[PDB]
Amino acid sequence: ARQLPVGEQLPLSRLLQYSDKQQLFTILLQCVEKHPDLARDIRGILPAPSMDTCVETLRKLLINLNDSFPYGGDKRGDYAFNRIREKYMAVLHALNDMVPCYLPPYSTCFEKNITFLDAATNVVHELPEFHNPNHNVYKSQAYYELTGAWLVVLRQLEDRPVVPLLPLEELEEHNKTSQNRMEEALNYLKQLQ
């Protein structure tokens, strides 16, 4: 005669449609935790962003933060900071993510790694200072970490003879803006001459 349908829950796919990017993005990570092997699989079918895309990212982030200050209050008071700590931290995390990507073990492309650090530093110059000294440790800590960053790259051009033309001028403008908390790299850079 005839087959009569048997009810059942709806299919996983149909159920995920009612899940948004953050929702899938979020519930996808939990999967990696349960079955860590997923890391390899995902990394392979998903190509990394272009040096430009990454750079473009930070810009939006900091531009995002720059427009987030109070409607018209002292952008250096604590209050102004309270509203920005969030988009502030966003720009920093992204800084901590992308930088190791262009450093010595993982990236041997000297001329390609320095180029990036240049852009990253410029992003840090743009960070916002505050009246409270407690809110400026982030910008200081940045300058420190980056000085350590350029130092790692510069070292990848040590023994390999012939010392190509180095960004002697770049570090100058960088350190100038950074009020000298990048001297360790500048000397090392010049010392490579």
Next chain:
Amino acid sequence: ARQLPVGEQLPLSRLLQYSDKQQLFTILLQCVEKHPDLARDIRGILPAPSMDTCVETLRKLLINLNDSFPYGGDKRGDYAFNRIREKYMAVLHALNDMVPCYLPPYSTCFEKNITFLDAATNVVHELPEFHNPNHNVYKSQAYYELTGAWLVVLRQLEDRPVVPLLPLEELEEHNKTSQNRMEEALNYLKQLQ
């Protein structure tokens, strides 16, 4: 002295940001395949859509298809069908997904299951007929399958005595519109009187 950073690939999360909804949705499914156990986990933290949300879904689908016909051609010719087969099939799949959800094993809520079938049928009345008979097997096949659907529900009110008030009139308008290819349910429905 000082720790010098060690480069590395960027973190999975940072890499997924450059992945869109379809991209995550798509690469998430592949995960379930490799580790089927994920099905249970996901189903639990993700609540199903409200009877209304599902209904709302189909509407958009068919409205989507209704606006997709050629710029001004015979919406019954083959050409017109070629452009719609896609959004056509979309409305059908969704029909095949959501219906089993409201049937006898999975759903015992008689008054809640029929209510849904009502809306689903109405969605099928709205389907587009064509000059070619080959393109109308989908609408026929629908009417058939749904007749089988109401039949399953109606059976869940069989032995359980007291035969509550049944949608005797609803099936009438339904079958009327469907040009009688739903008689098996209509009789059975009336036979339940």
